[PDB]
Amino acid sequence: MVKLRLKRCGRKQRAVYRIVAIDVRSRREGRDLQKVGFYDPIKSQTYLNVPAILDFLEKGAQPTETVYDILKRAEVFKEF
Amino acid sequence: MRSMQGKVICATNDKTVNVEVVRLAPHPKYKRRVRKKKKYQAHDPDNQFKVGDWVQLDKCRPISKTKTFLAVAPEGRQSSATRPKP
Amino acid sequence: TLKKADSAAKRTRQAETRRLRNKARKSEVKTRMRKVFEALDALKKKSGASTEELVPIDNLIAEAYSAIDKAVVKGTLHRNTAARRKSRLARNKKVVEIHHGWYTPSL
Amino acid sequence: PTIKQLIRNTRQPIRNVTKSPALRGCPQRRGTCTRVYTITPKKPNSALRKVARVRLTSGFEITAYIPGIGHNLQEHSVVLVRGGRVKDLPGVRYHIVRGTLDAVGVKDRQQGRSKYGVKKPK
RNA sequence: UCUCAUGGAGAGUUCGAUCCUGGCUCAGGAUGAACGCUGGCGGCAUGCUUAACACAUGCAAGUCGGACGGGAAGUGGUGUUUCCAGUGGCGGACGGGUGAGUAACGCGUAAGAACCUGCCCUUGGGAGGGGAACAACAGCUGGAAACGGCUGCUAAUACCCCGUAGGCUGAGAAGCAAAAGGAGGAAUCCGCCCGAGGAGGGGCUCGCGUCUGAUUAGCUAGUUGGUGAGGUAAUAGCUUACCAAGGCGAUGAUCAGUAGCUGGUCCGAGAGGAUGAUCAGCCACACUGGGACUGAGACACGGCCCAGACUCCUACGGGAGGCAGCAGUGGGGAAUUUUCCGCAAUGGGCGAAAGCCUGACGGAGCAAUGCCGCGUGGAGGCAGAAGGCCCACGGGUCGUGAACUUCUUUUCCCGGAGAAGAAGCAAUGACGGUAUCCGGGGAAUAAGCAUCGGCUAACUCUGUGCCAGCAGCCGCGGUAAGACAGAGGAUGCAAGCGUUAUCCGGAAUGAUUGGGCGUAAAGCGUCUGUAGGUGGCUUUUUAAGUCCGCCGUCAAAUCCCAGGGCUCAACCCUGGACAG
Ligand SMILES: [Mg+2]
Ligand SMILES: [Mg+2]
Ligand SMILES: [Mg+2]
Ligand SMILES: [Mg+2]
Ligand SMILES: [Mg+2]
Ligand SMILES: [Mg+2]
Ligand SMILES: [Mg+2]
Ligand SMILES: [Mg+2]
Ligand SMILES: [Mg+2]
Ligand SMILES: [Mg+2]
Ligand SMILES: [Mg+2]
Ligand SMILES: [Mg+2]
Ligand SMILES: [Mg+2]
Ligand SMILES: [Mg+2]
Ligand SMILES: [Mg+2]
Ligand SMILES: [Mg+2]
Ligand SMILES: [Mg+2]
Ligand SMILES: [Mg+2]
Numbered sequence: 021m022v023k024l025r026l027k028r029c030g031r032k033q034r035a036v037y038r039i040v041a042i043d044v045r046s047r048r049e050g051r052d053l054q055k056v057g058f059y060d061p062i063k064s065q066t067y068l069n070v071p072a073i074l075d076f077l078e079k080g081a082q083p084t085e086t087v088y089d090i091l092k093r094a095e096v097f098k099e100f
Numbered sequence: 101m102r103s104m105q106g107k108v109i110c111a112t113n114d115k116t117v118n119v120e121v122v123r124l125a126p127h128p129k130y131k132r133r134v135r136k137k138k139k140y141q142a143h144d145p146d147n148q149f150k151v152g153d154w155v156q157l158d159k160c161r162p163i164s165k166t167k168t169f170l171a172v173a174p175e176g177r178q179s180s181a182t183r184p185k186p
Numbered sequence: 187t188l189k190k191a192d193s194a195a196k197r198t199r200q201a202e203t204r205r206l207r208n209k210a211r212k213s214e215v216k217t218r219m220r221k222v223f224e225a226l227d228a229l230k231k232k233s234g235a236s237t238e239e240l241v242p243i244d245n246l247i248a249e250a251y252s253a254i255d256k257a258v259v260k261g262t263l264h265r266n267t268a269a270r271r272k273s274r275l276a277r278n279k280k281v282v283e284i285h286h287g288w289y290t291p292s293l
Numbered sequence: 294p295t296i297k298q299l300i301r302n303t304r305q306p307i308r309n310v311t312k313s314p315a316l317r318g319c320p321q322r323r324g325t326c327t328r329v330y331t332i333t334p335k336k337p338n339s340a341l342r343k344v345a346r347v348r349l350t351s352g353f354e355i356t357a358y359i360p361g362i363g364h365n366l367q368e369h370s371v372v373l374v375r376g377g378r379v380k381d382l383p384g385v386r387y388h389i390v391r392g393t394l395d396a397v398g399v400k401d402r403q404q405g406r407s408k409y410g411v412k413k414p415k
Numbered sequence: 416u417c418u419c420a421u422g423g424a425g426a427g428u429u430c431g432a433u434c435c436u437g438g439c440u441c442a443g444g445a446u447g448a449a450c451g452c453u454g455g456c457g458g459c460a461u462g463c464u465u466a467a468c469a470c471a472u473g474c475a476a477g478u479c480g481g482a483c484g485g486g487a488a489g490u491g492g493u494g495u496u497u498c499c500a501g502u503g504g505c506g507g508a509c510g511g512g513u514g515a516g517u518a519a520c521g522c523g524u525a526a527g528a529a530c531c532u533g534c535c536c537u538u539g540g541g542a543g544g545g546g547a548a549c550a551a552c553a554g555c556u557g558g559a560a561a562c563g564g565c566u567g568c569u570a571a572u573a574c575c576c577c578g579u580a581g582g583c584u585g586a587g588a589a590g591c592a593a594a595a596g597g598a599g600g601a602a603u604c605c606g607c608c609c610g611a612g613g614a615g616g617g618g619c620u621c622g623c624g625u626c627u628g629a630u631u632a633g634c635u636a637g638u639u640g641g642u643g644a645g646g647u648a649a650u651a652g653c654u655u656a657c658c659a660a661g662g663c664g665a666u667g668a669u670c671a672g673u674a675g676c677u678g679g680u681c682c683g684a685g686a687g688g689a690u691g692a693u694c695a696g697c698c699a700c701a702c703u704g705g706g707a708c709u710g711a712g713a714c715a716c717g718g719c720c721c722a723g724a725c726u727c728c729u730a731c732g733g734g735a736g737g738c739a740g741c742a743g744u745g746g747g748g749a750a751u752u753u754u755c756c757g758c759a760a761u762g763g764g765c766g767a768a769a770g771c772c773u774g775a776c777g778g779a780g781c782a783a784u785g786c787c788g789c790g791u792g793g794a795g796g797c798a799g800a801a802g803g804c805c806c807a808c809g810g811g812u813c814g815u816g817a818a819c820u821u822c823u824u825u826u827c828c829c830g831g832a833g834a835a836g837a838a839g840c841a842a843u844g845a846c847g848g849u850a851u852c853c854g855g856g857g858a859a860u861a862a863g864c865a866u867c868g869g870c871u872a873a874c875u876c877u878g879u880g881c882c883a884g885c886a887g888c889c890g891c892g893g894u895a896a897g898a899c900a901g902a903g904g905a906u907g908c909a910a911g912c913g914u915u916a917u918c919c920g921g922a923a924u925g926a927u928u929g930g931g932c933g934u935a936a937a938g939c940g941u942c943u944g945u946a947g948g949u950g951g952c953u954u955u956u957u958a959a960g961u962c963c964g965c966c967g968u969c970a971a972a973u974c975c976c977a978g979g980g981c982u983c984a985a986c987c988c989u990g991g992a993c994a995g
C-alpha cells in the first residue's frame with residue numbers, strides 16, 4: 021500500500037531524510053508520488069507540510085514508526 | 101487530443117476504409133517543414149464513404165489486428181459552395 | 187530428524203494438493219456443460235415442443251450454474267470467466283428455441 | 294547545398310580511424326616475441342634499428358620498436374607493448390614498454406628515467 | 416553613448432621564393448582508465464569495460480503456539496514455561512545482480528477504453544445446521560544415502576453438503592451462490608463472507624520521437640479485413656471454420672549488421688557532436704531450450720516438471736546441483752578490493768505484542784583511481800669560507816641558498832578527558848573509546864617528475880661521430896651537436912609528474928548557423944517528362960503552420976541562480992526558474 025516514510029540522503033555518517041509518500045514496494049530511495057516532510061537528527065531540524073500529510077492519511081496512507089511519532093509531535097493525529 | 105483529418109485511398113474492403121493522412125513536420129536538423137504521409141485502417145460500419153472522400157478520423161477501442169480508428173464525417177472544412185462577390 | 191526447508195518443500199506440497207482440488211472443480215464444469223450441450227443437440231435436431239422438453243434441460247442447466255458458481259467462490263475460477271460460461275449456456279438455450287420457434291425479439 | 298537534398302541525408306561524417314588496430318582499444322597489450330632482428334631505416338636516415346616481431350593476445354602479429362640503448366630481449370620472451378609511431382621505419386606502429394615483464398630497464402640512464410623504466414639512484 | 420553580451424586565438428609542414436586549394440601534425444579539456452618513476456596526511460567519492468566462462472567453502476527469506484492436533488525439555492507433576500518437525504496462514508512476484516537477447520509500443524513523451532487488483536483506507540449487509548477426510552503419531556516394511564511403501568489414527572481459520580443473499584446468467588420466466596473462529600473474567604480486540612467505492616500497483620491500445628547498409632527490391636497467405644462459433648481479467652487473427660483480396664513498400668518494406676533505452680555524463684562560442692560506469696526510473700534475463708502449476712500478483716534467480724550440456728556424492732542399485740546475491744578460488748586479461756563487523760540507524764517480511772530474520776542497508780578495511788584541503792617550516796642570516804659548474808683567468812653562477820641564530824607545532828610522538836548520530840518510558844551505538852578538546856616534548860617525521868631546436872616557457876659545457884641513439888609533425892646526428900648520452904644551470908607543474916589508449920575540440924575538414932564545382936577534387940554528352948520541391952498580382956474566407964495569453968505535465972538527483980551546513984573547499988540541504 022501507500023506508505024509515508026523516510027528516504028535516506030546526505031552522506032557518510034551524516035544523514036538527512038526526506039519524508040515521502042510512496043508505494044511500499046518501491047526501494048528505500050526509489051521513485052515516489054509526492055515529497056512532503058523533511059527531517060534530521062543531528063541539526064534537530066524537523067518540519068512538515070501538513071495539508072499533504074492529511075491528504076494522504078485521508079486516502080489511507082500508513083506511516084512507519086519513526087514517521088508516525090514525528091507526526092505525533094507536530095499534532096497531525098489530533099486534527100485527524 | 102486533436103483528431104486526424106485525411107482522405108480515402110481504398111474503400112474496397114467491408115466495414116473498413118484505408119485512409120491517408122498527410123501532416124507537416126519541421127525536420128529536426130534542417131528546419132524546413134516536410135510532408136509525411138501515413139496510412140490507416142479505419143473502421144466504418146454502414147460503408148458510407150467512397151474513394152476520394154475527405155474524412156475525419158477518430159480514436160476508439162481496437163476492432164482488429166489493425167483498425168483502432170472510427171471513420172467520422174468531415175469535421176469542418178471551407179465550403180466549396182459559391183459565395184457573394186462584394 | 188530435523189528438516190529445514192520451509193518455503194520450498196511446504197509450498198510444493200501445498201501446490202500439489204490445491205492443484206488436485208482445482209482440477210476437480212474445473213472438470214466438473216466441463217462435464218455438466220457437456221451434458222447440457224448433448225441435450226441441446228438432441229433437441230435442436232428432432233421435433234419436440236419445448237414446453238415439455240425444457241424440464242430435463244433446465245434441470246441440467248441449473249446443475250451447471252451450481253457447478254460454475256461453486257467453483258467461483260471456492261476460488262478455482264475468476265468470476266468474470268463464470269459470467270462467460272453461463273452466458274454461453276444461455277446463448278445455446280436461446281439458439282435452439284428460435285429454430286423450433288418460440289421467441290424472436292426484433293426491433 | 295540544396296536544402297531539399299540535405300534532407301536526403303547528404304551529410305555523413307567520416308569516422309575516426311585508429312592508428313593502432315592491433316591494440317583493439319587498449320593502452321597496452323602483452324605479447325610474445327616471435328623474432329628479434331634489425332632493420333635499416335628509410336633514407337637518408339641510415340642507422341641500425343632494434344625491432345622485434347610480436348604475436349599478441351588479440352592474435353595479431355606486428356613489428357614493434359625497442360627504445361633506449363641495448364636490450365636483453367630474445368625469442369619466447371613476454372613483453373608489453375604500447376602505441377606510438379616511428380616515422381623512420383615503414384610499418385612499425387608500436388613500441389615496447391621498458392622495465393616491465395621481460396624487458397628490463399635501460400642500464401645507466403640518468404635522465405627522463407620514467408620513459409625507460411629505471412630506478413632512481415640513491 | 417543607455418541596454419545586451421562574460422563567448423569563437425593559432426603554429427609548423429609541399430616552393431628557389433610567393434599567393435592559394437588542400438591534407439597530415441601540435442597546443443586544450445575528459446576519463447570506470449592502464450603502465451613507468453616518485454610518493455606524508457586528511458575530507459568526499461570510485462573500484463571485472465574482457466569470458467551472460469567455470470565454480471570448492473560459508474552465509475543471502477522467512478516468520479505466526481493468540482488457526483491446530485500431537486511429543487520433548489525441564490517442573491513435581493496439565494500451577495509455571497519453554498523449544499520443535501507436521502497440517503494451515505500470509506511472505507517467498509519486493510529487495511539484490513547482470514546487459515546476453517531486443518530496431519520492438521522495448522524506451523521517452525502525449526493521449527485513450529474494453530480491464531484486474533492480496534495488503535491499506537471509506538462504506539452497505541451478514542455469519543444458521545451438519546458431515547467426511549488427510550498428514551502428524553502408531554505398527555509393519557524397502558532403501559548405502561537421498562527419499563520412500565502398506566495398514567491403522569486424529570485436530571483445525573484445512574475439505575464437502577443444506578438453508579438464507581441489494582450480486583451473476585437471462586427479453587423474461589426463472590435459475591444459481593457465502594461463512595471461521597481465536598484471544599479476554601466481561602467490556603472489547605484481531606479476524607471471516609458478500610457487495611459498493613478510494614488511493615496506489617499492474618494488463619492492454621494508439622499519435623509523435625527512437626542506429627548503419629540499395630554491392631539488401633519486392634515481402635506477406637492467419638498474412639490484411641467480414642461473419643459464425645470458441646477463448647481471455649479485458650479489446651484483438653488471441654484461436655478456428657467459411658467468405659472477400661487485400662496489407663506493407665523507392666518518404667527504403669523485407670533481409671543482413673550493430674545496440675539494452677531514458678533522466679543524464681563529457682565536449683562545444685553557439686547550433687549541435689560523441690556516449691549511457693557509479694546515482695535514479697523502465698525493459699529484459701537467471702546453466703542451454705520448453706512447459707505449465709500454485710496464486711491478487713509469476714510463466715517465478717536461491718520453486719516444480721522434462722530434455723540437453725556439465726560438475727559432485729554412491730555401499731554403483733541410484734541420487735545431488737546451478738554465485739550474472741555478498742564476499743572468495745580458478746581462468747581470460749594491460750587491468751579492478753576483505754572467504755570483515757553489525758541489525759544501532761533507515762527500508763522491508765511475518766506477528767496481538769514481546770520479538771525474530773534481513774551479505775537490502777548502515778559501517779569498517781584494501782588501492783594516489785579520481786576530485787578537494789593541508790603540510791614537508793616562519794623571521795633573521797658578515798657578504799666572509801668549503802664544493803659543483805662556466806670562464807676571454809678579471810670573474811660569473813649554484814646562493815640567503817645551506818651552515819648558523821631565534822620564533823611556531825598544522826602534521827609526527829607520549830599521555831589524558833571524549834560526543835551528536837536515539838526515535839520522548841527507561842533502556843538500546845556496529846561505527847569507536849573513532850570525530851573533536853586539553854597537556855607534555857621537539858625543526859623536529861616528510862619532494863619528486865617532465866621539459867629546455869620551432870610550435871613552447873626554459874642553455875651552456877664535456878662525451879660520441881650517418882655510429883650509438885631521438886622524434887608529436889617538420890626533421891636532428893659524417894669533429895667543436897642549443898635536437899643523441901652525461902653534467903651543471905634554468906623552466907613548468909607539484910604529491911603528483913609523464914607515456915599509451917578512448918571521445919569532442921581546434922576542423923569552416925561533411926558547411927542549418929558555416930564551404931564549394933571556368934583552370935585546384937567537382938556540372939550528368941544533350942533534351943522530353945512522372946513523382947517531389949518552390950511558384951506573379953488583387954479582394955474575401957478559413958485558421959493548418961506562425962504569433963500572444965492562461966492551464967496541465969515534461970519524477971527526484973544533476974546543470975543554472977539565491978541562501979544555509981560540515982573550521983574552508985569538494986560534498987550535502989532548502990527554495991526558485993529561464994530555456995526547449
Ligand atoms: Mg536529537
Ligand atoms: Mg549552406
Ligand atoms: Mg582528431
Ligand atoms: Mg607541387
Ligand atoms: Mg624546402
Ligand atoms: Mg584549408
Ligand atoms: Mg592533453
Ligand atoms: Mg610503488
Ligand atoms: Mg561485465
Ligand atoms: Mg556450494
Ligand atoms: Mg545470518
Ligand atoms: Mg509464546
Ligand atoms: Mg516464539
Ligand atoms: Mg492469529
Ligand atoms: Mg500453560
Ligand atoms: Mg514449529
Ligand atoms: Mg514431520
Ligand atoms: Mg525479482
Ligand SMILES: [Mg+2]
Pocket residue numbers: none
Ligand atoms: Mg529486482
Ligand SMILES: [Mg+2]
Pocket residue numbers: none
Ligand atoms: Mg549495487
Ligand SMILES: [Mg+2]
Pocket residue numbers: none
Ligand atoms: Mg548486446
Ligand SMILES: [Mg+2]
Pocket residue numbers: none
Ligand atoms: Mg534485425
Ligand SMILES: [Mg+2]
Pocket residue numbers: 520
Ligand atoms: Mg507508447
Ligand SMILES: [Mg+2]
Pocket residue numbers: none
Ligand atoms: Mg513507432
Ligand SMILES: [Mg+2]
Pocket residue numbers: none
Ligand atoms: Mg509496455
Ligand SMILES: [Mg+2]
Pocket residue numbers: 533
Ligand atoms: Mg491470498
Ligand SMILES: [Mg+2]
Pocket residue numbers: none
Ligand atoms: Mg461488521
Ligand SMILES: [Mg+2]
Pocket residue numbers: 543
Ligand atoms: Mg454455518
Ligand SMILES: [Mg+2]
Pocket residue numbers: none
Ligand atoms: Mg450451496
Ligand SMILES: [Mg+2]
Pocket residue numbers: none
Ligand atoms: Mg471454506
Ligand SMILES: [Mg+2]
Pocket residue numbers: none
Ligand atoms: Mg491466553
Ligand SMILES: [Mg+2]
Pocket residue numbers: none
Ligand atoms: Mg477463553
Ligand SMILES: [Mg+2]
Pocket residue numbers: none
Ligand atoms: Mg472491495
Ligand SMILES: [Mg+2]
Pocket residue numbers: none
Ligand atoms: Mg542513443
